[PDB]
Amino acid sequence: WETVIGLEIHAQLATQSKIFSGSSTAFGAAPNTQASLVDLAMPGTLPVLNEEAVRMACLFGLAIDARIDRQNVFARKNYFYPDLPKGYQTSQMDHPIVGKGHLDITLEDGTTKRIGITRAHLEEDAGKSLHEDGMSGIDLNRAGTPLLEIVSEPDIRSAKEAVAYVKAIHALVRYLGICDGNMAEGSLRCDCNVSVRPKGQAEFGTRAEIKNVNSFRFIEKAINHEIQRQIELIEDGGKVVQETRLYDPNKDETRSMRGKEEANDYRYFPCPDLLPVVIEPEYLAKLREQLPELPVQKRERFESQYGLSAYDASVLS
C-alpha cells in the first residue's frame, strides 16, 4: 500500500484591519459588530488590499524559501452561499503571492525529511451559521477576515509526517508572528486530500478530501481511519466515488457532508476592480533583513555552537 496525501492549510493572519475592509479582527461573542460598509457588500462599494497582509504574505514567502513572483492578480471564486456576502470569493487562481517552496519537517526515527509546498496565496473568509432557533442566523463577524491558503505539494506520505508538517507550519508561522496559532480560537485550520493506491498499479484509489480538522490528534486519527477505509474499499472493489468528507472525534467515523454530482464550476477570472500588486526585489530585500531566525535552525544552532542536548534545545526553541 502507498498512501499519498495532501494538505490545504488556512492560516488566519493577525492584522488589525481586514484585508479589504476597515473593521477589526479579534473579537468576542458580539455578532455583526465587525461589519462596516465594505463587509456588507453594498452596491457601488469597492475593496482595497491591506498593506501588512501582503507584507506578511511575502514574508512567509521569503521564510519558506520560495520564488516570489513580481506580479500577482486576485481572481474570483464565484459560488452562491449565505455566508458569502458577494457573489464571488476573492482568492488567487493564477499568479499567487507565494509559489513553490520547501519546509524542513522534523520527524522521529532518524532522518529529518523535507516536504514541498506548491503554493501559498491570499484568500477570504465567509460568514458563520449556528444551530438556532425555524430558520437560521448568519453572522458576518468573521467575514472579510484575511486568509492565507498554504497549499502543499503531495509529497507528504504517512499520517505522522502530516502531523509533523502541521506542527512545523504552526511553529514557523507563530515565529513569523503572522497567525496566533491557537487552533482553539479557530485561527489555524486545515484540510486533507488523502488518497491511497496499491504498489505496482497506478490504478484504483480515489481521492478523499476530509475537511475541518482541528487538533493534531484529530488529524492523525482521521487520516489513519481514512487510509484503512480506502484500503478496504479498494479491497472489496465496490464503488469508488469522489466526495468531500468530514471527521467527528466523538465516534471517530467519517461522515459525508455533500455528494459531488459534478465538478463545481467556480468560474475563475482576474478581478477587474483590483489591479495586480507589484512586489519588487527591494521589498524582499528589506523583509529578508527583517526575517527572524527560524526555530528549526535555531534549535540546531542551539545544538552546534552552544553546548546543549537535543531535548532541552528543542523545548527551549
Next chain:
Amino acid sequence: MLHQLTLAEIARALADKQFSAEELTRTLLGRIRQLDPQLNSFISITDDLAIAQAKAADERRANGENGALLGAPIAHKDLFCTQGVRTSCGSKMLDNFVSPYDATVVEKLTAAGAVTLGKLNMDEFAMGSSNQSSHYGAVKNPWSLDRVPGGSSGGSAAAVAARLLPAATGTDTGGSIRQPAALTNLTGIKPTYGRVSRWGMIAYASSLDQGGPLARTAEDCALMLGVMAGFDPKDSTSVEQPVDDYLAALQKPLSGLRIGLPREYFGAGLDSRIADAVLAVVEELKTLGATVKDISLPNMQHAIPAYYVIAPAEASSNLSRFDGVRYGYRCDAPQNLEDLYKRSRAEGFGSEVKNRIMVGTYALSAGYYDAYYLQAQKIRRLIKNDFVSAFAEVDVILGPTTPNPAWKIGEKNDDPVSQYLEDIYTITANLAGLPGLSMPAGFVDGLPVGVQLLAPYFQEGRLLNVAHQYQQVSDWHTRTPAG
C-alpha cells in the same frame, strides 16, 4: 424666462445679486412637476432635501466660499448612491433601496455648492441603449415624442435638452453617453479610465464603467469635470494625476493642429446625410485653421463583438451579489435557499439583463473561456495598440457618432440586432479607455445628430479646448422654446 439656464450665466447672475438659489430651484421644480409626466424623465423628486440644500446654498453663497459653481441645480443618475434617496438604477430588483452612504461624486459636488433636485430614469444597470427597457417607463425625446432620447443615459440628455436642467451626471460603459447626447444635440464628455472615481457608483462593467458629465455647452461640462475628477483612496482603479485646470484651457487657437479622419468611420453602415454633416464639420475645422490627415484602424470593425463578450462577463460577476439576502427586493414565498436565489434573481429584471448575464456566464464558463473572454481581451489589446500607434502623428481623431438617426418606439426593441448595430464607433474609446467627446453637428429630418472626437490619455483639456474653439463657429442656443 428662466429656461435659458447655464452654469456660467447662472453663476454670473447670482454674482450680480438677482435672487437666491431657493427662488431658482422652486421655479425650476415648478416647471419640472408640471411637464414631467409627458416625457417621464424623472423617477423621484425629493423636495425637502432640495429646499434644504437650496437654503444651505444661500447661506454658503452669502460668504461666497468654496467653488466656481455656487448653488448650481444638478441632478444625478440612479446609479450613484445617495444618502436618504432611493438608489435603484431603475430596476425592480434594487427598488425600495435607501442607501445608508452617499457617493464620492455626489458628496464632492454638494460640498462644492450644488443643489440636487432628484433622480432621472435610466436603463436597468446601464444595460441597453434605448431606455425602453425601463421598469418605470420608456423615456420620450424632446424633439420627437414618438422616438427615443437614447441610452443608457437617455433620461439625463432628455432632461437637459428639454430645458428642465442645466447640467446632469451621466455614465459611460459602452457608448452610453455619446449616443444620448447626439440624439438630443448635447455635449457629452468621457474622461480617461481612472480619472473619475467609482466609489458609490454601482458597477455594470468595472473595466469599462466611467462617470462623466452631460450638459449643453462644452464650458459647462468642463466646469463639472473640473470638479468631479480626481483621485479617491477608497477606490483602487483611481489614478493620481494633478491636471485639473480645464476652465483656463479655453480660448487656445487651433493653429496647425493635426486631425485624423479614419477610413473605417466611413463604411456601409452610416447614412450619407450624417456623412455630409461630418464633412461639413471637417471643412469648418479646416477653416478654423486645423490640418486633416487620413489615418487607419485595422481592428476597428472587430470592436463590436469583443465588447459584448467583456462587458456582459464582468456583469455576470458584478451582479452576482444581487441575491436579496442583505438588501433590495426579497421573494414573497422563499421555499428554499436555491429557490431564494433563483426566484429573487428571476424577479429582478426581465429579458435584457437576464440574457446578458447568461451570455456573460457562458463566456466565463469553463472551456469557452480561452475561446471567448481571453480572445476578446487580446482583441482589446490590439485595439489599444492601434490607438497608441495612430496617435503618434495625430493629436485628435474625429468621426461620426451614431450611424443611424433616432428610431421610433414599439419597433425593434425586442430585436437586439439593430440595438447592437447602433454602437459601432463609440465603443472603441471605451475598450481603449481613452477620453472622448460628442458634440452635435447639425440636424437630419428635424432630428439632431452629433460628431465624436477621441483624444489620448490624460489630456481632456485639449479636447474641450478644440470643443471651445468649435463653440465659436456655430451655436445652436435658441432651441429651448420649442422643447
Next chain:
Amino acid sequence: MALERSDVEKIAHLARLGLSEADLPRTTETLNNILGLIDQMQAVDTSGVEPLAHPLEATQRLRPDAVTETDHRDAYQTIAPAVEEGLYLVPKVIES
C-alpha cells in the same frame, strides 16, 4: 456556435435564473443570435499577443492597517427584509 435548451438550462443553473417554459424558446433564439454575433472574432489570429484586463498599466495597491469606526445596528436593518436579534434570516435546505 450552437445551443440546446439544456445548455441554457445549465447556464441558468450557474448564474441562478428562474426560467419558465414560455420564456425558453425566445431566450434560446436571442442567445443564439448573440453568439452568432460574437463568433466573428474567431477568424482573427491572436498568437503571441497578451490580454488586456485593465485600460491603464497601474501598479501596487496598498492600504495601511488602519481601523475605521464602526456603525450602529439600526443602519443595517432599515433595508434588510429579514431580521432576528441582528442576524439575517435565510432558508437552510438546498436541493434542486
